[PDB]
Design a binder for this molecule. Structure first.
Ligand SMILES: *CCC(=O)N1CC[C@@H](Nc2nccc(Oc3cc(C(=O)Nc4ccc(CN5CCN(CC)CC5)c(C(F)(F)F)c4)ccc3C)n2)C1
Length: 278
């Protein structure tokens, strides 16, 4: 724990009392706060310190990774931590909302052009986590994909019908390829406005469906581009040994196209926010 909040490339001296509470955001505990010294509005997570040694280092270990991801623009930035007797406070850049909530606000699909930018960002985030830190995510899903009013899209981990788990994770006798599967499911969900696995009696039913049924692919009658359908189908390869790794996914036409294509995510996000409530 250093003595500073690091924000937009600068290091500001800080103490817990410099933070002013503007209200809770979640429903582990999350507050919108104002840093007095600068007026920057930030997101702060409050965690109780659990007395398990190993169970309290994976707190530290995961922070370590995010703190050292300043050079990746697709990962949510951590500004710093405050540790008191009972509590760790974790200060993060505030993102407007997550993809899950945009789906709800939309009451329907998110357009492909937005999803294309989201795909490049999330794939690059994961690739970065693997190559620079040797970590895997393990919970890729729409609620862990953050957007803001500057049109940025970033990967996060909130740590707290729908199923995103790869078949080989449901029932082993997992490496990066499980996250690839979770990306694909996420995309079908966001692109259709609908959970991919349809007839959801129970949790067991759904996990059985993942194991037994064919992957739910993008439907062909919604104008989805051929390369988006292909990308999703490659992510949703059941046999994990056949499933592409990130370097192969980064070579895919869908990605290459959306890297260069100018898309105005900012204005879209602003529109959506100005036209909806929760
Ligand atoms: C659906 C949106 C929603 O409900 N919101 C409520 C709050 C709103 N905005 C917001 N803005 C920014 C941050 C935030 O929440 C936080 C996020 C994080 C965070 O993302 N933590 C984090 C931890 C760990 C990792 C690294 N990984 C290591 C490998 N594995 C472990 C096996 C997974 C974790 C990441 C990483 F993925 F790199 F991004 C991120 C922390 C604190 C807060 C407050 N809410 C939107």
């Amino acid at each position: 724990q250093t003595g500073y909040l690091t924000i937009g490339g600068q290091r500001y001296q800080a103490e817990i009392n410099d933070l002013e509470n503007l209200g809770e955001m979640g429903s582990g505990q999350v507050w919108k706060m104002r840093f007095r010294k600068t007026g920057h509005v930030i997101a702060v997570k409050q965690m109780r310190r659990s007395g398990n040694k190993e169970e309290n280092k994976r707190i530290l270990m995961d922070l370590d990774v995010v703190l050292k991801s300043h050079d990746c623009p697709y990962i949510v930035q951590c500004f710093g931590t405050f540790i008191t007797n009972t509590d760790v406070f974790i200060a993060m850049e505030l993102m407007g909302t997550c993809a899950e909530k945009l789906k709800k606000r939309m009451q329907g699909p998110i357009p492909e052009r937005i999803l294309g930018k989201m795909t490049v960002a999330i794939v690059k985030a994961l690739y970065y986590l693997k190559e620079k830190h040797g970590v895997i995510h393990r919970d890729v899903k729409p609620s862990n994909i953050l957007l803001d009013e500057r049109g940025q899209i970033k990967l996060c981990d909130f740590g707290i019908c729908a199923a995103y788990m790869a078949p080989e994770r449901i029932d082993p006798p997992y490496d990066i390829r499980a996250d690839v599967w979770s990306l694909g499911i996420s995309l079908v969900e966001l692109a259709t406005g609908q959970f991919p696995y349809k007839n959801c009696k129970t949790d067991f039913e759904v996990l059985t469906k993942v194991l037994q049924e064919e992957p739910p692919l993008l439907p062909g009658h919604m104008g989805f581009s051929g390369d988006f359908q292909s990308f999703v189908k490659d992510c949703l390869t059941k046999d994990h040994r056949k499933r592409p790794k990130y370097n192969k996914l980064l070579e895919h036409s869908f990605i290459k196209r959306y890297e260069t294509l100018e898309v105005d995510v900012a204005s879209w996000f602003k529109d959506v926010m100005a036209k909806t409530e929760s």
